[PDB]
Design a binder for this molecule. Structure first.
Ligand SMILES: CCCCCCCC/C=C\CCCCCCCC(=O)OC[C@H](O)CO
Ligand SMILES: CCCCCCCC/C=C\CCCCCCCC(=O)OC[C@H](O)CO
Ligand SMILES: CCCCCCCC/C=C\CCCCCCCC(=O)OC[C@H](O)CO
Ligand SMILES: *C/C=C(C)/C=C/C=C(C)/C=C/C1=C(C)CCCC1(C)C
Ligand SMILES: *C/C=C(C)/C=C/C=C(C)/C=C/C1=C(C)CCCC1(C)C
Ligand SMILES: CCCCCCCC/C=C\CCCCCCCC(=O)O
Ligand SMILES: CCCCCCCC/C=C\CCCCCCCC(=O)O
Ligand SMILES: CCCCCCCCCCCCCCCCCCCC
Ligand SMILES: CCCCCCCCCCCCCCCCCCCC
Ligand SMILES: CCCCCCCCCCCCCCCCCCCC
Ligand SMILES: CCCCCCCCCCCCCCCCCCCC
Ligand SMILES: CCCCCCCCCCCCCCCCCCCC
Ligand SMILES: CCCCCCCCCCCCCCCCCCCC
Ligand SMILES: CCCCCCCCCCCCCCCCCCCC
Ligand SMILES: CCCCCCCCCCCCCCCCCCCC
Ligand SMILES: CCCCCCCCCCCCCCCCCCCC
Ligand SMILES: CCCCCCCCCCCCCCCCCCCC
Ligand SMILES: CCCCCCCCCCCCCCCCCCCC
Ligand SMILES: CCCCCCCCCCCCCCCCCCCC
Ligand SMILES: CCCCCCCCCCCCCCCCCCCC
Ligand SMILES: CCCCCCCCCCCCCCCCCCCC
Ligand SMILES: CCCCCCCCCCCCCCCCCCCC
Ligand SMILES: CCCCCCCCCCCCCCCCCCCC
Ligand SMILES: CCCCCCCCCCCCCCCCCCCC
Ligand SMILES: CCCCCCCCCCCCCCCCCCCC
Lengths: 256, 256
């Protein structure tokens, strides 16, 4: 059972992580150019099975604001969890091997991140981006249901596996777009885009490995709070890695 | 818990009857349908992120008759499996626990084929849009499975159900965006039969959701789990025949 001292230490760790997210949010808000990525519709110009209009831009993602949004969401939920007011509810949740505020945050923050990665790869169709957001949110909600209905060592990973099925779909989409079957242009995917997809695919898999390790509950992973710390570190590293790779690639003032 | 021989034999034959209706429609569509196809496209960057795209390219084509036969055939197959041998014993045992895993395994494939076809009929073609629609629709079904796995009727817990509604509505928001066609240079003339498909199947999809809601509320006649089991079998039969013959009438008749 987690002790009062262990829970209080974790709340301090949440606060520190929140400060790192918040200061990066500020730096991106302040320093980023107005670089935008399109969401498009490619409408039928006739009955189904005939021809299409050219893609039209429906709206544009303000990329700096979107990066600031996923950093800011992490900061907000870390500050909420860190609060003395939430000590009773955190302790109650951690005693049931649950952190629900993590899933509420990730359902929005990780979904913003995967949409931005898709747009950076050139995925623009508004339904592609909407459905990527939804299936990524679904991945998180399956992880939430793993925590709600199972305990470590109980032999039940069904929600986890459903989360893996939902979770892999956006990444199959990215892989299709970088392979670009049927593509005409000899223009190559930029290095920095490969860097984003490869690094963030590794991090996304890392989150899945934490829930797997926690619910397997073997060796040091018998201690649920080890997973709780791992999630805080992985969110910090993943969101910083994506923020600064996008910033370096697209948001610098030489590109304004 | 054990069912009466009369109860479980009655459901066995209900499955067989539904299966025969699906199977005969599958044959009629396979035999009679033309070679009408709908594209899946890639619209690749032909420059750096935030610049220009190639014209959309067709990566592959959905053979619409075959895809309609597929969703009918999946329903037929699962109805025959559920009424057969050792699978029938598992089906009976699961019904006694207020579960039908066979239903969710089938629907995760059959309803996902259906919503992708509806998306393509509306002119959604981007291969990642269609992949992510398939994934988020599958997710909706898997949330319905987790509602049955972890909760009991009347227990007041609908969290997996609500998660299923969040995932489930995403493709339909996509369809609505495409028929409104925001940013279109000219008004988009969507055929009547396409509106028929979207409106009718939206009503049917909401009907499936209402059955699970009514079962887990468990009030009045819905306290009997098997009443919901019968409602699902009827809705699957009516929804799939409605979509099959609307697509057939709209697209599959004339020789190409
Ligand atoms: C060189 C740069 C200097 C940076 C100065 C940062 C100062 C204030 C920012 C907010 C600081 C809040 C950090 C919380 C620290 C914390 O919670 O530590 C737990 C400890 O055990 C008990 O406080
Ligand atoms: C802590 C862990 C976080 C580590 C950050 C991870 C990866 C940075 C990747 C940046 C790599 C940029 C590659 C550039 C390149 O490959 O060049 C291709 C050429 O420029 C065509 O554009
Ligand atoms: C029982 C399901 C009844 C659902 C009937 C829904 C029909 C919708 C319809 O007929 O719409 C097509 C037409 O173009 C008019 O807009
Ligand atoms: C900023 C926070 C991020 C990037 C969080 C990402 C979280 C995931 C990629 C979670 C993945 C999971 C699965 C693939 C299976 C179910 C368990 C999850 C939710 C941990
Ligand atoms: C041929 C089979 C079909 C069309 C089945 C469709 C099923 C659904 C639309 C199910 C929807 C559900 C929700 C929206 C919430 C959770 C419960 C479900 C799975 C019944
Ligand atoms: C509520 C959330 C989203 C609901 C989506 C609805 C799905 C489709 C059904 C109705 C579609 C018919 C709308 C006609 C609009 C035509 C137009 O104004 O151009
Ligand atoms: C069972 C319920 C099925 C109801 C489905 C039928 C809808 C058909 C209406 C669409 C006809 C197209 C209208 C047009 O061509 O303008
Ligand atoms: C041991 C605690 C370290 C606290 C760091 C606080 C954040 C610093 C911001 C720069
Ligand atoms: C770790 C928090 C410090 C703020 C982010 C660093 C700013 C990078 C600017 C380039
Ligand atoms: C749940 C949110 C998904 C719907 C967002 C799509 C809104 C698009 C409408 C914008 C129209 C602007 C015209 C160009
Ligand atoms: C030019 C457009 C500027 C308006 C800002 C729009 C911000 C982007 C938010 C749109 C969200 C809805 C789109 C659905 C896809 C992902 C959820
Ligand atoms: C207990 C920890 C509470 C810290 C909350 C910090 C909020 C910072 C808000 C900044 C707004 C721009
Ligand atoms: C019972 C309500 C709980 C809501 C959970 C919060 C998660 C939000 C998911 C948003 C997904 C948007 C899909 C597009
Ligand atoms: C075992 C049940 C789940 C199977 C489907 C899940 C798909 C995810 C596998 C992708 C592997 C990524 C590489 C690491
Ligand atoms: C021995 C078996 C080990 C299985 C470990 C599973 C955890 C990683 C798989 C994640 C796949 C889905 C990832 C989705 C987001 C990219
Ligand atoms: C289950 C998800 C896998 C989707 C496969 C995508 C098909 C790509 C085909 C490329 C061939 C065109 C050249
Ligand atoms: C750096 C701000 C403090 C947050 C702590 C997280 C440290 C993880 C390091 C990840 C940063 C990678 C930056 C990528 C470089 C882009 C080129
Ligand atoms: C008691 C009613 C039984 C009717 C079964 C119908 C058999 C399938 C015929 C398809 C034509
Ligand atoms: C419903 C049982 C038989 C299936 C055939 C449905 C009618 C097909 C004729 C359309 C042409
Ligand atoms: C603990 C419950 C076990 C889940 C049953 C697994 C589902 C059986 C068959 C599913 C395979 C479908 C593959 C489609 C591609
Ligand atoms: C143990 C895992 C059980 C698998 C679930 C059975 C059916 C799920 C099939 C979902 C397919 C999703 C495809 C995404 C594109
Ligand atoms: C037909 C209209 C489509 C409705 C779309 C539903 C999307 C899910 C919304 C989240 C759940 C909200 C209701 C939760 C109520 C819980 C209180 C007991
Ligand atoms: C209060 C009564 C709530 C009834 C909820 C059942 C219907 C709502 C389902 C919405 C999601 C539909 C997704 C597939 C179209
Ligand atoms: C049983 C329901 C059958 C409905 C058939 C739909 C007819 C569509 C043709 C126009
Ligand atoms: C409810 C399932 C029983 C079979 C339905 C018969 C199919 C209707 C044929 C419609 C003809 C459209 C051309």
């Amino acid at each position: 059972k987690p002790t009062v001292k262990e829970i209080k230490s974790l709340q301090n760790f949440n606060r520190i992580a929140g400060v790192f997210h918040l200061l990066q949010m500020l730096a991106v808000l302040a320093l980023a150019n107005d670089f935008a990525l399109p969401m498009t519709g490619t409408y039928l110009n006739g009955p189904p099975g005939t021809t299409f209009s050219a893609p039209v831009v429906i709206l544009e993602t303000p990329v700096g604001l979107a990066v600031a949004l996923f950093l800011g969401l992490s900061a907000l939920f870390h500050f909420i969890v860190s609060s003395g007011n939430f000590f009773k509810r955190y302790s109650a949740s951690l005693m049931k091997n649950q952190n629900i505020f993590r899933w509420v945050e990730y359902s929005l923050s990780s979904s913003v991140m995967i949409v931005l990665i898709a747009q950076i790869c050139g995925i623009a169709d508004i339904v592609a981006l909407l459905a990527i957001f939804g299936v990524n949110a679904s991945m998180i909600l399956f992880g939430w249901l793993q925590e709600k209905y199972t305990q470590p060592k109980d032999g039940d990973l069904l929600p986890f596996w459903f989360g893996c099925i939902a979770g892999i779909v956006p990444w199959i989409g990215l892989l299709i777009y970088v392979i670009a079957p049927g593509s005409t242009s000899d223009v190559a995917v930029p290095g920095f885009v490969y860097g984003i997809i490869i690094s963030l695919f590794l991090f996304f898999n890392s989150f899945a490995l934490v829930q797997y390790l926690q619910y397997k509950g073997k060796g040091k992973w018998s201690n649920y709070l080890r997973g709780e710390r791992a999630y805080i570190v992985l969110s910090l590293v993943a969101k910083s890695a994506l923020a600064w790779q996008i910033f370096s690639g697209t948001l610098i003032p030489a590109l304004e």
